[PDB]
Amino acid sequence: TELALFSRVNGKFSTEFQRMKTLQVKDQAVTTRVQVRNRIYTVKTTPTSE
Amino acid sequence: TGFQICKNALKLPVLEVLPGGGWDNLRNVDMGRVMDLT
């Protein structure tokens, strides 16, 4: 704002507002599942055992 | 009727997949030695 009256009385009025905003969200979800199953032998009793 | 005598001489594995065994046709699982293995 600038106001000059009678070419003698001067006035100035400078007003500034400034807002800055920042947001960051970061999500990580790692899931891991390992499953090993070995079956080597099948052992049975002889039918003629005691 | 062991195979250790042959293994001591030849020094070879014995073929572990052998026929002549029983078989449960229902449960689909080997059962017992029917033929004679010598």
Swiss-Prot record, chain A:
Expressed constitutively in a variety of cell types including macrophages, microglia, neutrophils, T cells, marginal zone B cells, keratinocytes, splenocytes and intestinal epithelial cells. It comes from the Eukaryota. Induction: By CSF1 in fetal liver macrophages. By interferon-alpha, by interferon-beta, by interferon-gamma and by bacterial infection with E.coli and M.smegmatis in embryonic fibroblasts. The chain crosses the membrane at residues 11-16. Pore-forming protein involved in both innate and adaptive immunity. Plays a central role in antigen cross-presentation in dendritic cells by forming a pore in antigen-containing compartments, thereby promoting delivery of antigens for cross-presentation. Also involved in innate immune response following bacterial infection; shows antibacterial activity against a wide spectrum of Gram-positive, Gram-negative and acid-fast bacteria. The MACPF domain includes the central machinery of pore formation: acidification causes a significant structural rearrangement, leading to oligomerization and deployment of the transmembrane beta-strands (named TMH1 and TMH2) that enter the membrane as amphipathic beta-hairpins. The P2 region contains beta-hairpins to interact with target membranes. Belongs to the MPEG1 family. This is Macrophage-expressed gene 1 protein. It comes from Mus musculus. The chain holds residues 117 to 166 of 713 of the full protein.
